[PDB]
Design a protein around this ligand. Structure first.
Ligand SMILES: [Zn+2]
Ligand SMILES: [Zn+2]
Lengths: 130, 174, 131, 113
């Protein structure tokens, strides 16, 4: 399994510890602000297109930082790419990292958002209004 | 006035060290000082650039007898039936590394055929061009949604030209 | 997108070298087929001091001649076409070409008709002590 | 994770010019949304260097509007004979929302340089 887990620890702070499962995704109860064409609102869905790694610390204590790796369409993989490649500057951008990895015989793409935070401004504002 | 003929196709805008650019336009404005180019030891030459190049704007019409002018005029194609066969192709542009080039994907004629093929193109290299295979996507037009299942299943050029010249060699051989 | 490149006025010219498979005798028939030259060779500049060896890393020129680039001097590579080179491309891509004053109108026919001599490293006849 | 808006913004041709009177009847390209209030208009598309006014018949055709235009946005489309200069005027004081959806439908339709 690890070569993956290895291979998404990229180059930095190899102290990871998948509080996920193995190489499968995760299931989180997170409160989005959503508005496609059909649904809408500010509500708490069950999201699951993400593998989630809790980065640990020297002395091997946990520590609030995360690597969130999402897996989606090739085409969309390109869009995200060319965009990120346009905009890798204004420091308010979490430093992404793209790659292609294999699961089985499948060359599934993967995007790796680096060092985030367990929550998001959503969970704050939401679970303070409601 | 500049050409889409041999117009560069990759997004990299850093001019070529003119010892790696076969034309007086593909030189960065670091060498052109009053229409002349001055050698620069301040930076060495580059060996890391793989850009596809456009293949448009031809307008082929030299004038010699040693080749017969391929394009036939109004009558010389009306007179000669038992040769009429269609020719049309569909194309697309690349995604990440480059864009701005037209390359074929499906080829149709008068014969009830529509050949599939993966796109490839002349990438520029510090030694010559290579004939490289690049990621492809159809144009964003929604009427090209029919063109979705054609990019991940096409064919290279060698087998394609064999099969095409052989469709020729059994349908037009008569 | 990318970067512009060719002149539309010599389009036809490169067209004859884009679709040709016997492109050498083809383009020499073109130079002699009712046309004016490929008006885009990179124009270098040097002190015109040094030996006559054109194939040089930094312009190595005479008082008479004049330097163009190294790469922009082979039509086999000027047209991105395939090469009959054994392995498998053209050499002059990367250096410079100081052609003597006479034959320096077009360096394509020069690079193809002449080729450097191993003795003096110059173009064979311009000049040489080759016997 | 939150998609914006699948579109339906139409495009017509009509009248615009530089002053209240300079607007010739056919030279501009309106992008608009027929909302609750007629063919409610959003932005202008043109090829001319400048057009500071436009004129369009009303809902029923009573009068001709005298809707001024923005300092146009510069860009180049492609036509089979190379690049072609084009400007995108906006009806001044049009907030980010419709500017955005117009850019959406537009850049969707026209691929630029
Ligand atoms: Zn060559
Ligand atoms: Zn010699």
């Amino acid at each position: 399994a690890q070569s993956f887990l290895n291979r998404v620890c990229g180059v930095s702070a190899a102290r990871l510890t998948p509080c996920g499962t193995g190489t499968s995704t995760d299931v989180v109860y997170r409160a989005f602000d959503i508005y496609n064409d059909k649904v809408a609102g500010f509500a708490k869905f069950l999201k699951t297109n993400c593998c989630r790694f809790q980065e640990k610390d020297e002395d091997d204590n946990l520590i609030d930082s995360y690597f969130v790796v999402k897996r989606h369409t090739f085409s969309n993989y390109q869009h995200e790419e060319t965009i990120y490649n346009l905009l890798k500057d204004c420091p308010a951008v979490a430093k992404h990292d793209f790659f292609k990895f294999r699961i089985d015989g499948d060359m599934v793409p993967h995007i790796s958002r680096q060092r985030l935070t367990k929550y998001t401004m959503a969970d704050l504002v939401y679970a303070l209004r409601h | 006035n500049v050409t889409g003929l041999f117009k560069d196709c990759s997004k990299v805008i850093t001019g070529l060290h003119p010892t790696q650019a076969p034309t007086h336009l593909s030189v960065d404005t670091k060498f052109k000082t009053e229409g002349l180019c001055v050698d620069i030891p301040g930076i060495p030459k580059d060996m890391t650039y793989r850009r596809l190049i456009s293949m448009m704007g031809f307008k082929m019409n030299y004038q010699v007898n040693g080749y017969p002018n391929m394009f036939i005029t109004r009558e010389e194609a009306i007179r000669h039936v038992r040769a009429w066969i269609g020719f049309d192709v569909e194309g697309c542009h690349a995604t990440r590394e480059a864009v701005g080039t037209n390359l074929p994907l499906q080829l149709g004629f008068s014969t009830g055929v529509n050949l599939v093929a993966v796109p490839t193109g002349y990438v520029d290299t510090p030694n010559n061009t290579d004939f490289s295979r690049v990621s492809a996507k159809p144009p964003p037009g929604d009427q090209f949604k029919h063109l979705i299942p054609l990019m991940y299943k096409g064919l290279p050029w060698n087998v394609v030209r064999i099969k095409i010249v052989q469709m020729l060699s059994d349908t037009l051989k008569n | 997108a990318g970067n512009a490149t060719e002149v539309p006025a010599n389009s036809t010219v490169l067209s004859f070298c884009a679709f040709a498979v016997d492109a050498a005798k083809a383009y020499k028939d073109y130079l002699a087929s009712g046309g004016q030259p490929i008006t885009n060779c990179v124009k270098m500049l040097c002190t015109h001091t040094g030996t006559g060896q054109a194939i040089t890393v930094t312009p190595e020129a005479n008082m008479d001649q004049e330097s163009f680039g190294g790469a922009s001097c082979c039509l086999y590579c000027r047209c991105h076409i395939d090469h009959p080179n054994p392995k498998g491309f053209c050499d002059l891509k990367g250096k410079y070409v100081q052609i003597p004053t006479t034959c320096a109108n077009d360096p394509v026919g020069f690079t193809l008709k002449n080729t450097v001599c191993t003795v003096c490293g110059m173009w064979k006849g311009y000049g040489c002590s080759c016997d | 994770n939150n998609e914006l808006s699948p579109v339906a913004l139409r495009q017509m041709s009509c009248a615009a010019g530089t002053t209240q009177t300079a607007c010739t009847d056919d030279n501009a390209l309106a992008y608009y949304n027929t909302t609750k209030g007629g063919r409610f208009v959003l932005a202008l598309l043109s090829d001319l260097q400048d057009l500071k006014w436009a004129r369009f018949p009303k809902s029923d055709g009573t009068g001709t509007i005298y809707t001024e235009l923005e300092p146009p946005c510069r860009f180049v489309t492609d036509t089979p004979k190379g690049p072609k200069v084009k400007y995108l005027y906006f009806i001044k004081g049009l907030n980010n929302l419709n500017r955005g959806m117009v850019l959406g439908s537009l850049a969707a339709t026209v691929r630029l340089q």
